[PDB]
């Protein structure tokens, strides 16, 4: 049963029930009254990273396999920023469709960071 | 779960003499 | 007219047993791999399979002539062998210049012309052109079986398919066969292969690796067979025009034999230059 | 008599070409499940455009696998999502399953995009071109480009296009990139490459 | 125990009718008769002996993810990205079609001649009355789209695998889950009824197999390798249970054995991927279809 629980500026994300370092993840936010928008990507073993043009050079990811967890260090933030922020991880292993979905079922509960 | 898997064994063995793969 | 024939010990077997050994394998494994494309639905399988089965019919003979050159140029079996191996030499490499030509205007049509002709290329007219062109091959064979005057000899050893001076017939015969079995061929084949690099260099989503890759390969199999039927026609034609004598006759004896030596490489290019190349069979390969 | 009319409707099936319309609500696909019909110099072409199902479309979008081109259309006067309809692109050039398909690419929207400039991404600082609508149109596109050319390179490619509302020439832009689709199949397959 | 040891079996008959690629099939309950359903819009209903086609149906549409045989034999059905289930009489006319389902259809399965099940991409299953075309029941208990079904021998239960990493049980006449199953990391693309029906089998996009029993509530066996990293396109059981089928998308069918877990044939002659598997009634052959055009039969 998967499950991605988040905390937390520095936001960690915790994942269970499954294989962390098969898959690519993600960082999906929620600004109020809009719809879900994609941040930071990074692969499997973190060498490929990509990023939303807004947040180029400002916040820095970093995935650590050995404690199953993701990290997005965001520093020099904006009142643009406050949002609902989930952790995404597109289902399929060794390899991105649905995950800025409506209603997507392998992301977080999320936490709200209000600046 | 031991007596599911008991019972799923003897299920197979008891219809192994009429499967022809 | 006596004639020192020392060019065939010295050099004509050699060339038989390396086309040989050679060529035999590579013509059984291009046939299986034309027999697997003919198991799809595409056409060139089967222009593939006619080509290689001709290559095949000609190899078959060249033991008989192997040992007549060791033998000192002497043949020793009946006349029918004679007239039968003779054909499969001189005559069988239209068959294979003729599927040639049907594979190069096949590549023509599908690559200049997608959304076009396709009834033209489907197996039923495959089928259709491979019977027309063995037709050639049965009334040719005929034509030359007629003719049982073509064994010879002098100094006691028996000569096959060649007289010094020529005769009427080959000389009324040479004539056709230049014209149609060479200057028609090669007109087609440049036709095809300007346009099919007409049409790719034209392209758009093809790469710049691929543009070059293809022009080599064309330009490689158009000289190729210009290079092994070009001398051969040339002296047949000169031959045939002047040859009148035998001092003529003895003097190019040496030059004509040897162009007729460079004709044995077609069955031995054409897997090459139409089977191996294709990446389907690399891999296998 | 089943085999006659098989061999019949085999001959029709191959005649004509499928193509998958995708895009954005606000992307003006529709005017560029239904399924459409059109006909160029006696080629049928059949357009399907999905919109009977959810937004979840990693399962479906196995369907088109064997199809002969994708039509992505961009509405490319919106900087808001246009990183969103960056991501779809991207999302649809990877997938395992279009891997060897075509794209052809539909940037809409060009009269509102020059009245937009003519009144999000860092990087335009430091643009040249290969004026300021030339500039934007160029970025926009080299912004797919790079995602195109980034990966894929002998299997597929990406055949761009500009395109306004009153457009009329898009059926022939169809016609002729699938042309050169096919001309890449039968190259592969004559054993000229 | 004794292991089942290497499983040979190869290909006897080839069926060559089909334009575009195979996406669904079926047995009939005489073990000779199968329908088949492709992609280009035909339905073909072969026979396994002679290989002869006794019927073929032009499909209004092309997109056909699912077929169905009538139990008594004389109806069919089939469904789609039309969201539509269409029934054709064996007396070929359209009797019927039924149309409830907001997402695209994703299984069926005929109860009786007057009964089908249904299964859609929007999350939800159907049970219908073919006489007056309407829906009598509706189970809302999945998050993602439901991939396929299988009806138990009694035909009172069923259970079906959606695009969530879960599986649910439900009782047909009282309308409401029993049960769920969590034990997959990805999407479940199909799911089969042990013969006695008291199991299941289930693949997934993880590239793994497991084994639910009802009574217990938990996985028992996890059929898996460190080599295999795609997923699985379809299961199918054997006469006694023992013997696990599974189609990949490696264009390769393993045969799995259910208890010990360990693969003990393989099934190697499509030239891509494997899409369809079935076990006929009586156990004596096994069609398999793949995205090659070609149906082949193997005993
Ligand atoms: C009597 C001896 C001395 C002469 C032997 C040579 C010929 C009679 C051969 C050589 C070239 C051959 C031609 C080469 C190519 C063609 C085209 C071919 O048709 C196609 O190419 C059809 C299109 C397709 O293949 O899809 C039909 C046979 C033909 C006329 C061949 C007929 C027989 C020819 C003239």
Redo the contacts between chains.
């Keep these: 049963?998967?499950q991605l629980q988040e905390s937390g500026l520095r936001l960690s994300c915790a994942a269970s029930?499954?294989?962390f370092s098969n898959y690519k993840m993600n960082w999906v936010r929620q600004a109020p009254g809009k719809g879900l928008?994609?941040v930071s990507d990074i692969s499997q073993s973190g060498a490929s990273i990509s990023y939303?043009?807004?947040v180029?050079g400002r916040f820095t990811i970093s995935r650590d396999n050995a404690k199953n967890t993701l990290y997005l260090q965001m520093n020099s933030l904006k009142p643009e920023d406050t949002a609902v922020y989930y952790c995404a991880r597109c289902?399929?292993?060794?390899?991105?469709?649905?995950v800025?979905?409506?209603?997507?079922?392998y992301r977080g509960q999320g936490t709200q960071v209000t600046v | 779960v031991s007596k599911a898997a008991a019972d799923l064994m003897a299920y197979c063995e008891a219809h192994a003499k009429e499967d022809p793969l | 007219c006596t004639i020192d024939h020392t060019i065939h010990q010295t050099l004509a077997p050699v060339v038989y047993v390396t086309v040989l050994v050679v060529g035999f394998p590579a013509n059984c494994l291009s046939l299986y791999f034309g027999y697997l494309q003919i198991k799809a639905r595409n056409e060139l399988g089967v222009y593939l399979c006619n080509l290689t089965v001709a290559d095949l019919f000609y190899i078959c003979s060249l033991p008989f002539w192997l040992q007549y050159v060791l033998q000192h140029d002497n043949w020793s079996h009946g006349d029918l062998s004679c007239q039968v191996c003779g054909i499969l030499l001189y005559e069988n490499i239209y068959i294979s210049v003729g599927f040639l030509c049907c594979i190069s205007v096949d590549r023509y049509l599908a690559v200049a012309h997608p959304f076009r002709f396709h009834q033209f290329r489907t197996l039923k007219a495959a089928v259709g052109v491979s019977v027309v062109i063995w037709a050639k091959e049965l009334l040719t064979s005929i034509y030359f079986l007629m003719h049982e005057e073509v064994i010879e000899d002098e100094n006691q050893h028996r000569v096959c398919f060649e007289h010094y001076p020529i005769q009427a017939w080959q000389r009324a015969i040479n004539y056709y066969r230049f014209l149609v079995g060479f200057l028609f061929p090669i007109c087609l084949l440049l036709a095809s292969y300007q346009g099919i690099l007409r049409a790719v260099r034209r392209s758009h989503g093809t790469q710049k690796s691929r543009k070059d890759q293809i022009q080599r390969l064309v330009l490689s199999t158009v000289v190729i067979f210009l290079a092994c039927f070009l001398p051969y026609h040339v002296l047949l034609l000169v031959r045939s025009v002047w040859e009148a004598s035998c001092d003529f006759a003895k003097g190019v004896f040496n030059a004509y034999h040897f162009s007729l030596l460079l004709t044995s490489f077609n069955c031995v290019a054409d897997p090459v230059l139409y089977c191996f190349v294709s990446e389907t069979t690399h891999r296998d390969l | 008599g089943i085999e006659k009319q098989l061999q019949k409707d085999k001959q029709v099936y191959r005649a004509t070409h499928r193509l998958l319309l995708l895009g954005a609500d606000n992307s003006g696909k529709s005017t560029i499940i239904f399924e459409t019909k059109f006909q160029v110099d006696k080629v049928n072409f059949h357009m399907f455009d999905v919109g009977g199902q959810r937004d979840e479309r990693r399962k479906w979008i196995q369907c088109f696998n064997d199809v002969t081109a994708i039509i992505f259309v961009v509405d490319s006067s919106d900087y808001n999502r246009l990183q969103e309809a960056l991501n779809d692109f991207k999302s649809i050039w990877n997938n395992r399953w279009l891997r060897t398909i075509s794209v052809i690419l539909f940037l809409n929207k060009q009269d509102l995009l020059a009245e937009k400039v003519l009144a999000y991404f860092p990087e335009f600082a430091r643009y040249t071109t290969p004026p300021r609508v030339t500039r934007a149109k160029y970025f926009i596109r080299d912004e797919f480009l790079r995602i195109s050319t980034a990966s894929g390179d002998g299997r597929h490619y990406c055949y761009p296009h500009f395109t306004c509302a009153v457009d009329t020439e898009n059926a022939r832009r169809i016609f002729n990139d699938c042309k050169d689709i096919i001309l890449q199949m039968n190259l592969r397959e004559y054993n000229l490459v | 125990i004794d292991p089942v040891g290497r499983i040979q079996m190869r290909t006897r008959r080839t069926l060559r009718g089909h334009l575009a690629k195979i996406y669904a099939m079926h047995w009939g309950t005489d073990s000779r008769l199968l329908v088949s359903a492709s992609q280009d819009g035909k339905l073909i209903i072969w026979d396994s002996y002679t290989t002869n086609k006794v019927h073929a149906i032009p499909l209004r549409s092309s997109w056909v993810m699912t077929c169905a045989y009538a139990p008594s034999g004389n109806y069919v059905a089939c469904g789609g990205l039309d969201n539509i289930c269409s029934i054709y009489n064996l007396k070929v006319r359209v009797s019927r079609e039924l149309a409830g389902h907001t997402g695209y259809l994703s299984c069926c399965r005929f109860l009786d001649d007057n009964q089908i099940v249904t299964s859609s991409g929007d999350t939800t299953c159907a049970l219908w009355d073919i006489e007056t075309g309407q829906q009598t029941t509706t189970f809302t208990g999945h998050t993602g789209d439901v991939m396929s079904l299988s009806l138990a021998p009694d035909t009172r239960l069923f259970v079906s695998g959606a695009c969530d990493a879960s599986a649910k049980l439900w009782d047909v006449r009282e309308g409401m889950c029993r049960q769920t199953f969590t034990g997959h990391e990805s999407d479940i693309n199909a799911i089969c009824f042990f013969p006695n029906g008291n199991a299941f089998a289930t693949g997934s996009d993880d590239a793994t197999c497991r084994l639910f029993d009802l009574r217990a509530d938990q996985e028992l066996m996890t059929y898996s390798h460190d080599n295999i990293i795609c997923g699985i396109t379809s299961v199918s059981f054997s006469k006694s249970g023992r013997l696990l089928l599974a189609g990949y998308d490696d264009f390769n069918c393993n045969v799995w054995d259910a208890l010990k877990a360990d693969r003990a044939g393989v099934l190697a002659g499509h030239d891509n991927r494997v899409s369809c598997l079935g076990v006929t009634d009586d156990g004596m052959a096994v069609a398999t279809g793949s995205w090659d055009s070609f149906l082949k039969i193997w005993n």
């Design positions: 049963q998967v029930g499954f294989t928008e994609w939303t043009g807004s180029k289902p399929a292993p060794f390899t991105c469709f649905d800025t979905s409506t209603t997507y079922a």
